[PDB]
Amino acid sequence: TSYIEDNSNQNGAISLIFSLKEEVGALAKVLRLFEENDINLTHIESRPSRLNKDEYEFFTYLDKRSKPVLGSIIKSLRNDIGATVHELSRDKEKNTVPWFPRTIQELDRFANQILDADHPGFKDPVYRARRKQFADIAYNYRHGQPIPRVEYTEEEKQTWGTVFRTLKALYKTHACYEHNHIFPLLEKYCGFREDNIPQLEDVSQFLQTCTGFRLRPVAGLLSSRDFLGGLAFRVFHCTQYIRHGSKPMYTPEPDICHELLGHVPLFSDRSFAQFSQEIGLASLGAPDEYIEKLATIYWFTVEFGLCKEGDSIKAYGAGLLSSFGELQYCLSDKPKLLPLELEKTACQEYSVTEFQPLYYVAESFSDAKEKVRTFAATIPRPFSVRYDPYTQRVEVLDNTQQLKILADSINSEVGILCNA
Amino acid sequence: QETSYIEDNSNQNGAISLIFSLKEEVGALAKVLRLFEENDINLTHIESRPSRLNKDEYEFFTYLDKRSKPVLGSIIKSLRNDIGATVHELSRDKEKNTVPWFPRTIQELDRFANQILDADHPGFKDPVYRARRKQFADIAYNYRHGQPIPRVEYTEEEKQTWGTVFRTLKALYKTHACYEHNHIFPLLEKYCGFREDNIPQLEDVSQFLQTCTGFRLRPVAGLLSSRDFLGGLAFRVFHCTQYIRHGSKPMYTPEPDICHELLGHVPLFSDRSFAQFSQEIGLASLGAPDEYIEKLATIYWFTVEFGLCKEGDSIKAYGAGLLSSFGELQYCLSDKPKLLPLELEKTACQEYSVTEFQPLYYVAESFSDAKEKVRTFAATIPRPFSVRYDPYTQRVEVLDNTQQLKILADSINSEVGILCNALQ
Amino acid sequence: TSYIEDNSNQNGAISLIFSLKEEVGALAKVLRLFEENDINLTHIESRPSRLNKDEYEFFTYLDKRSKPVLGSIIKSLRNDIGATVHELSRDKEKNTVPWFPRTIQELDRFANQILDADHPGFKDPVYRARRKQFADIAYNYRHGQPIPRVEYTEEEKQTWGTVFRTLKALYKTHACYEHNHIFPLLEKYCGFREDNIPQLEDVSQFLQTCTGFRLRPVAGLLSSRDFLGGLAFRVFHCTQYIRHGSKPMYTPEPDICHELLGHVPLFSDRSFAQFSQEIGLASLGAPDEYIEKLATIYWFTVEFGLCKEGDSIKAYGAGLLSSFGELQYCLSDKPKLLPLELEKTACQEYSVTEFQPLYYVAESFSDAKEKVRTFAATIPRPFSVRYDPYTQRVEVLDNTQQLKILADSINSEVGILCNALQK
Amino acid sequence: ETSYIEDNSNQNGAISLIFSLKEEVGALAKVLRLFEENDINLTHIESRPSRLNKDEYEFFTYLDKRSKPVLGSIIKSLRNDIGATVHELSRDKEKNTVPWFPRTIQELDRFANQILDADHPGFKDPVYRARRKQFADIAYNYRHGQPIPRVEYTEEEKQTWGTVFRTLKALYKTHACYEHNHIFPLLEKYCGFREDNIPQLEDVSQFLQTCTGFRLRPVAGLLSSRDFLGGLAFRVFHCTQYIRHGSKPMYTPEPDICHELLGHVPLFSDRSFAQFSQEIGLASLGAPDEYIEKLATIYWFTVEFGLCKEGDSIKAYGAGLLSSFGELQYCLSDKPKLLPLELEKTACQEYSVTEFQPLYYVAESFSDAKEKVRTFAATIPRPFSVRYDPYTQRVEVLDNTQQLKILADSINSEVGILCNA
Ligand SMILES: [Fe+3]
Ligand SMILES: [Fe+3]
Ligand SMILES: [Fe+3]
Ligand SMILES: [Fe+3]
């Protein structure tokens, strides 16, 4: 029930993924195809191919205002020029790949897609106006800007201290080794104290120093497709508000207690950063049927996952390390335990309110990453994906010549490994 | 005999970094921070981070200098005797038993980017041109990492100097420049404004290089030392100038000006195969002795600056000093000068001059072939550790002998996995 | 429990695994070190190291005849010469690694170690005298010889036809894809017919063409250590006799119906050949506590194992594909199914007489191979092993040698992949 | 006058069809029927499972020129109706066909009798001439798998061997490579490499099989370059069994037992060198005649007359140097020119077989030289790549992208072991 389907705006998003071999007038005739169709020369970004030395890569920033001229441009690119063109569409019409950000800067177009009666603090006028304050800050956040520092009230630090003290007194014996290895660093350099709520900017700079992970403040719950897409760029969309103080041990939406105490410590581990990033890469362009399956894998791993540690079993999921009740429950004899196998984990039924009657126990973060990679090969998409941390852009792999470049790259790295 | 190698000098404060790991134990992390805390050292000068290989170890980044020399000797002894950790002492002054200092993070390039060592310069009796050099120098002196490069409006007289160098060199790129140069240059003309009547802004060029290979531009007032300039290449940071040469002599510049940087270095920096070659030279310089910094500067001279590369059965030019000089570009591709195959065993010890043309050029087989030779030459550089750049964190990983194989094994394992899912 | 502990003869078997750096007189003084103790110059085989260009690898074929002089020789190799020597011993005495064959020709030493009361056909003199014929053929069989072709009687082909007809009518819906992929080839080229019993030589030559697997005729049941050790060489020790015709659906011992219809078809698949070989490599030099655990893993996988195939589950174990009764049982609602996890599979209890109440479902033959290899890393032995199909010998690898031989293997496999992507 | 020998064809020739088939309902039945309905025996069409694709079958067709009429119809049906990728091997090397090459180690017997006696030393010796007919019959009747027949050498022949053996032995320490001087002591103790004794091929073949899996196949004389190189892909070294005439102990117009055992055998026991010679053989499988000669030229300046660096010195590893007292002392002098091994122009270098070599190529190492041959193999025009399977002793013909995915997963498993080590 944690899967949220993605919605579309009035403008939407359309991207044309195609390469072009350098020829006499080749780059000019492609820009002519867009210029002669009343498409601005700033939406058509051309860059050199990061694999083929003789090809250009095009980044088209379009929307639903190009529907009439799209059919003519795609036909010329496929028939006359004869290039492989991939049509991205946000509305996910047939014969089109669902839209996904190709660069880390493209995460801003759908960062405002956010999903009252029995919510805790609905009848609190001080708390209600403060939720509009944190939401407005997130709506105005753009990539590159520093996360705005918000002064927290004394009453909110009490809510954080209640969740902090109970969970910290249980981390030593119930949390995984990675959690208890990163957490002391967060207490000293990010101010992870009982009487202090850490700032997202101080945590974002810490995550960038450990694994390059970035925090982007969001007003609420993004769609499963948009949230996973951020993991491919090692960007963790998180909230900035805190839960209501009347019931400190319940939150229908991820609050700052869930993000900083559940996701942040494990995100500082590189082996875990690659696992969460691999899930995001599988979501890029994935169909709706497989976005939900990836959200289910995300539920039984990053959110409510167990990991082996010698002859014992510890918890690494964020929903367990941010919930005092289920943390004592996950490492007990009440629930059933099954080995992590994504062939049936993605089709496993679950609930978001009550405890999990069944948990999947992973062998290691590296083992879980390889399973997500193998599962990604079954996701119907006409290409594979690879992240380039130097440029913070996604490399779209389709040509066999690109694999020749990747094969020679591996061969060179192996040759360096032989010299020892 | 008048070379391009510039030895590095030290300031009054200098820079000192302690490289050491720590196995996680009961109170281990607390007693290490106390060792610096009890010596009135701020908890921001001692940055502790988890080890990216050993799950049970911490990695420490100590940002100190010469203002901590008295208490430093006591701290290092406790880390080696009491705590018992392997400590490598980086020092800017390069005292004995210490590894020469090198930046570990991309933000550490600001410490020595303003240390630069008016007579026969063209336009020495021009106060407007002199005062404008003071303007560009102040911009570089006040520039910090992360800040956007200030956009400077260039005068019409400066566009005349740029237009003369731009038009003459462009008429030779098709037949004399390498394929990589002629592949990037059309993109620079359309998206960076590489026109005859326009001088591109460094910020617009820096944003373009970040999209291609992640290369960044760092404004500098003049010529940095070979150690500091090469160290920036390890972070894919290209220290470059912002001023333009004087208009009296449009085909002469004693120092690299904006015409030399944007037309010689920038286009090739957008190529990934060339970006890795230049980065490997920078990685070899990190912590290298002075004898090998000059040897790397000589390799840098006969490759990145004045290097030729094979392209089928023909020979093209890829050096920056050739693609930014109308005279020497026509000279390099003739039968008059001597040509030798690029082999760093004797290329690094070749003598050259900066004023007159090069009597000898080295012809590389490819950027990939030259990259492997630089890494092979780096294995002979006496350093008690290896180095690797991490683009995710923009920091340098200090790898000993054991951590070398684990990094490559984990990298090959990831690269093979992506190749499997692509083969479907 | 299908685990059979290995016994030792009066002579036993002793092998010294040690390398030698090439020096002035080094090779001469080592051969002299054995020659000066009246040890034959043919039992001490010296070969070059397949990794270090400057080292020699020694294959010593000894036994209990050298026990008094062994302690003196080992000291010189460790103290004077200074080489790392590991003593293999069949009796599995302390400070010695349990013996295992290093070459494919060394499978002949313990091929006669075999484990009449309630057997079907005990009161049949024709069937009993025929068991003496198949046993004698196996006792005299040596490595390299062609498997002797035995003509089966009409009464035996009737027994074969009953087991063949029932299993063939059930293979399509119950057997895995690999089984139904090899079986049509076996019917056309090996004579897998209802009215014909295939010859072992014709089947052994077929397996060599598919996965390089070889058949070695044995008189009966070898020990678990000796049987698994043959898998490291892709050699399948099998029997040649047939079950008695009175009970066509019962056999207390593995008969020709179990070997040719249960083990042979899956052995022709490469993905399964690597899985069965990986289990054999883990047994080489393994302690007795882990030989039984490997036999237990072998029981719930190769013998009685299930594998997923989409959203369905099929059978690939040999005890299921050679038994019409249990094949309908394994893919029914009667038994309990559990995911294959060797953490408790090696300690899982079972029985050999009655059907299995619980089966382990593997994800794939490749997935099961990786689980066995991960389990093999925990087996306490002072070295690793790797099979060399070029020389048909086992390479003894330690921590430093593993990195070089694997990196050189990866370098070669990546290199050819670079050219194939270039068409 | 080069060492390249073009291959000839018999009246029957040899034709092999390389094609795979995905398993479907009636797929295997329609292929066997396609050959049965054209009077092609079901024993010439050997079907085996694909050693990579779990869902495909691999077909080994043993045909020749006596199936030409029905071949054109079958190949068209396999490509149009069934729709499978079919590669037609042909010995006569007609156009649109790949030159024939053995796919299995047993297929080396078909053209092992193709051998190309006037001014030869010992022409007026009836005992030596009749003895040449004796060794030829042993090779003509030899089939793969049989043990090499042991021939007792006469006292007069042991004298000829002793003259070549003693002279070469006094130079191996300072002129031969380290690998040669590392293997040679083992050959003296276990193969009988003595001055007064000529080793038997069976004893030598079993030694090579234990070291690198190399096998010796007795041949009556000189096979074609295509057939000889093709044997290297299976690590099979076609060699002779006769000895040179005793009148000229330091001359032999044809490779004799002195050249094979003293030049090729010791280095063949080195695994790094065994892969190098095998890599050249793999490049020859299906290569055009223009590239068989180029590979024979690379083989000439490397395996036959090649030099290798060894520290700051240069030693000899070629077989033509380690089996010739005159050219071995000459190659490591200042008279001939030395050049680094670079196959871009080495394969087009002109040479002679009679007189000494005026130019030698110096390799860096056996591992470095192997990669150069593999790089050269990528330019050889063939519609597939090759891989040898030592388990089945058969050559894997790779065309599809699914086969590469399976090979990539194989590489992934070995990398995982290296990470957890
Ligand atoms: Fe969460
Ligand atoms: Fe420059
Ligand atoms: Fe069995
Ligand atoms: Fe020869």
DSSP string, D189-241: HHS---SS-PPPHHHHHHHHHHHT--EEEE-SSPPPHHHHHHHHHTTEEEE--
How far is residue B393's CA from residue A213's CA, in Å, rounded to a whole number? 8
- Read off the tokens for A7: 């919605």
Helix or strand or coil: residue B137?
helix
Give every CB contact of residue B276 below 8 A, 6+ residues apart in sequence: B367, B371
How far is residue A298's CA from residue A292's CA, in Å, rounded to a whole number? 10
Instruction: Check the annotation: does D44 bind a ligand.
Output: no
Per CB-CB distance under 8 Å, the chain D contacts of B420 are 405, 408-409, 412
- Read off the tokens for D330: 């000459």
Q: Is C357 on the interface with D (CB under 8 A)?
A: no
* D184: amino acid identity, one letter: F
How far is residue C115's CA from residue C113's CA, in Å, rounded to a whole number? 7
Asked if the Cβ–Cβ distance from C418 to A408 is below 8 Å, we say yes
What is the D301 CA–ligand 2 centroid distance (Å)? Answer: 44
Q: After which residues is chain A broken (C to N over 2.5 A)?
A: 115
Distance of CA A49 to the CA centre of its chain: 25
How far is residue D348's CA from residue B329's CA, in Å, rounded to a whole number? 34
- Read off the tokens for C144: 């390299």
How far is residue D300's CA from residue B250's CA, in Å, rounded to a whole number? 58
CB D57 within 8 A of CB D49: yes
Which of D132, D90, D138 lies closest to D113 in space, CA to CA? D138
Residues in chain C: 423
How far is residue A188's CA from residue B58's CA, in Å, rounded to a whole number? 14
Residues forming a β-bridge with D237: D216
Q: Which of D259, D269, D279, D396 is catalytic?
A: D259
How far is residue D101's CA from residue D386's CA, in Å, rounded to a whole number? 11
Per CB-CB distance under 8 Å, the chain C contacts of A343 are 308, 363
Which of B79, B86, B71, B72 lies closest to B20 in space, CA to CA? B86
Helix or strand or coil: residue C380?
coil
- Read off the tokens for B18: 């302690």
Which of C385, C379, C261, C388 lies closest to C327 in space, CA to CA? C261
Give every CB contact of residue C352 below 8 A, 6+ residues apart in sequence: C1, C2
Nearest to A48 among B212, B379, B390 (CB): B212
Residues in chain B: 424
How far is residue A71's CA from residue A77's CA, in Å, rounded to a whole number? 10
D125-130: long-range contacts (C-beta < 8 A, 24 or more apart)? Answer: D125/D245, D128/D245
How far is residue D139's CA from residue D72's CA, in Å, rounded to a whole number? 36
For tokens 């003693």, name the residue. D166
Please, what is the angle between helix D366-377 and helix C399-421, to 10°? 20
CB D35 within 8 A of CB D47: no
How far is residue B374's CA from residue B303's CA, in Å, rounded to a whole number? 11
Burial of D407 (0-12, 13-18, 19+ CB in 10 A): buried
How far is residue A387's CA from residue A277's CA, in Å, rounded to a whole number? 9
CB A368 within 8 A of CB A275: yes
How far is residue D144's CA from residue D231's CA, in Å, rounded to a whole number? 12
Sheet holding B338-341, edge to edge: B314-317, B307-311, B360-364, B338-341
How far is residue A209's CA from residue A198's CA, in Å, rounded to a whole number? 16
- Read off the tokens for C347: 């300690």
Q: Using alpha carbons only, how large is chain C's radius of gyration in Å?
A: 23
What is the A246 CA–ligand 1 centroid distance (Å)? Answer: 22
Rounded to the nearest 5 percent, the helix, strand and coil shares of chain B are 45, 15, 40
What letter does residue D246 receive in the DSSP assignment?
Answer: T
Contacting chains of D (3 CB pairs or more, <8 Å) are B, C
SS3 of C271-325: the string is HHHHHHHHHHHHHCCCCHHHHHHHHHHHHHHHHCEEEEECCEEEECCHHHHCCHH
Total number of domains constituting chain B: 1
Report how far apart, in Å, the C-alpha atoms of D84 and of each of A238, C384, D79, D386 are.
Answer: 53, 43, 5, 19
Scan residues 363-382 of B and list those with Cβ closer than 8 Å to A: 368, 372, 375, 379
Task: Work out the minimum CA distance from D122 to partner chain C, whole angstroms.
Answer: 39
How far is residue A259's CA from residue A3's CA, in Å, rounded to a whole number? 18
How far is residue A227's CA from residue A6's CA, in Å, rounded to a whole number? 10
How far is residue B28's CA from residue D103's CA, in Å, rounded to a whole number? 64
CB A69 within 8 A of CB A38: yes
Q: After which residues is chain C broken (C to N over 2.5 A)?
A: 115
Say how many C-beta atoms besides its own lie within 10 A of residue B183's C-beta: 22
CB C219 within 8 A of CB D404: no
Report how far apart, in Å, the C-alpha atoms of D145 and of each of A134, A142, D106, D210, D285 are.
Answer: 82, 75, 8, 16, 22
Task: Work out the minimum CA distance from C386 to partner chain A, whole angstroms.
Answer: 19
Say how many C-beta atoms besides its own lie within 10 A of residue C353's C-beta: 5
How far is residue A417's CA from residue C25's CA, in Å, rounded to a whole number? 35
- Read off the tokens for C91: 């009796």
Give every CB contact of residue B297 below 8 A, 6+ residues apart in sequence: B3, B4, B5, B226, B230
How far is residue D262's CA from residue D183's CA, in Å, rounded to a whole number? 11
Ion ligand 3: residues, CB < 5 A? C 254, 318
How far is residue C156's CA from residue C121's CA, in Å, rounded to a whole number? 13
Give every CB contact of residue D71 below 8 A, 6+ residues apart in sequence: D15, D17, D63, D88
In CATH, what number is assigned to the domain containing residue C69? Answer: 1.10.800.10
- Read off the tokens for B393: 């964190």
Distance of CA B231 to the CA centre of its chain: 5
Which residues constitute the domain of residue A372? Answer: 1-420
What letter does residue B67 receive in the DSSP assignment?
Answer: G
**Which H/E stretch holds residue D325?**
helix D325-331
How far is residue C126's CA from residue B247's CA, in Å, rounded to a whole number? 114
- Read off the tokens for D375: 């790089």
Which of A25, A21, A92, A23 lies closest to A58 in space, CA to CA? A21
Report how far apart, in Å, the C-alpha atoms of A154 and of each of A119, A157, A161 are.
Answer: 22, 5, 11
How far is residue B229's CA from residue B4's CA, in Å, rounded to a whole number? 12
CB B315 within 8 A of CB B334: no
- Read off the tokens for B217: 């531009």
Give every CB contact of residue A256 below 8 A, 6+ residues apart in sequence: A160, A197, A238, A239, A240, A241, A242
Burial of A116 (0-12, 13-18, 19+ CB in 10 A): exposed
The pair phi, psi for residue B90, each rounded to 5°, is -90, 135
The dihedral sign for the CA sequence B172, B174, B175, B176: positive
The pair phi, psi for residue C182, each rounded to 5°, is -90, -35
The dihedral sign for the CA sequence C139, C140, C144, C149: negative
Helix or strand or coil: residue C378?
coil
Helix or strand or coil: residue D125?
coil
Helix or strand or coil: residue C220?
coil
SS3 of chain A: the string is CCCCCCCCCCCCCEEEEEEEECCCCHHHHHHHHHHCCCCCCCCEEEEECCCCCCEEEEEECECHHHHHHHHHHHHHHHCCCCCCEEEEECCCCCCCEECCCCEHHHHHCCCCCCCCCCCCCCCCHHHHHHHHHHHHHHHCCCCCCCCCCCCCCHHHHHHHHHHHHHHHHHHHHHECHHHHHHHHHHHHHCCCCCCCCCCHHHHHHHHHHHCCCEEEECCCCCCHHHHHHHHHCCEEEECCCCCCCCCCCCCCCCCHHHHHHHHHHHHCCHHHHHHHHHHHHHHCCCCHHHHHHHHHHHHHHHHCCEEEECCEEEECCHHHHCCHHHHHHHCCCCCEEEECCHHHHCCCCCCCCCCCCEEEEECCHHHHHHHHHHHHCCCCCCCEEEEECCCCEEEEECCHHHHHHHHHHHHHHHHHHHCC
- Read off the tokens for B324: 């930014």
Helix or strand or coil: residue B66?
helix
CB A201 within 8 A of CB A147: yes
Residue C306, sorted as left (phi over 0), alpha (psi -120 to 50) or beta, turns out to be beta
Beta-strand relationship, B216-219 and B237-240: parallel
User: Alpha helices of B363-400 — where are they, by DSSP H?
Assistant: 367-378
D1 is catalytic: no
Residues forming a β-bridge with C168: none
- Read off the tokens for D128: 């030596």
Residue A109, sorted as left (phi over 0), alpha (psi -120 to 50) or beta, turns out to be alpha
CB D111 within 8 A of CB D7: yes
How far is residue D322's CA from residue D273's CA, in Å, rounded to a whole number? 15
For tokens 């040649």, name the residue. C240
Q: Using alpha carbons only, how large is chain B's radius of gyration in Å?
A: 23
Give every CB contact of residue A187 below 8 A, 6+ residues apart in sequence: A193
Report how far apart, in Å, the C-alpha atoms of A286 and of each of A368, B423, C310 are.
Answer: 19, 18, 20
Residues in chain A: 420
Rounded to the nearest 5 percent, the helix, strand and coil shares of chain C are 45, 15, 40
Beta-strand relationship, B216-219 and B314-317: unpaired
Q: What angle do CA C98, C103, C107 make, to 5 degrees?
A: 70
B74 is catalytic: no
CB C223 within 8 A of CB C5: yes
How far is residue B156's CA from residue B199's CA, in Å, rounded to a whole number? 10
* C241: amino acid identity, one letter: Y
How far is residue D127's CA from residue D131's CA, in Å, rounded to a whole number? 6
For tokens 């170690």, name the residue. C113
CB A127 within 8 A of CB A114: no
Q: Using alpha carbons only, how large is chain A's radius of gyration in Å?
A: 23
The pair phi, psi for residue D317, each rounded to 5°, is -125, -5
Distance of CA C56 to the CA centre of its chain: 28
For chain C, the maximum distance between any two Cα atoms, rounded to a whole number of angstroms, is: 72
CB B216 within 8 A of CB B85: no
Give every CB contact of residue C379 below 8 A, 6+ residues apart in sequence: C282, C286, C287, C290
What is the A125 CA–ligand 1 centroid distance (Å)? Answer: 27
Q: Is A414 on the interface with B (CB under 8 A)?
A: yes
Resolution of the experimental model in angstroms, please?
2.9
CB C363 within 8 A of CB C308: yes
The pair phi, psi for residue A238, each rounded to 5°, is -140, 165
* A44: amino acid identity, one letter: I
How far is residue B358's CA from residue B147's CA, in Å, rounded to a whole number? 38
Asked if the Cβ–Cβ distance from C407 to A417 is below 8 Å, we say yes
C303 is catalytic: yes
User: Residues of C at the annotated binding site for Fe cation?
Assistant: 258, 263, 303
Which of C105, C88, C101, C117 lies closest to C14 in space, CA to CA? C88
For the annotated catalytic residues of A, the residue numbers are: 258, 263, 303, 322
How far is residue C386's CA from residue C277's CA, in Å, rounded to a whole number? 10
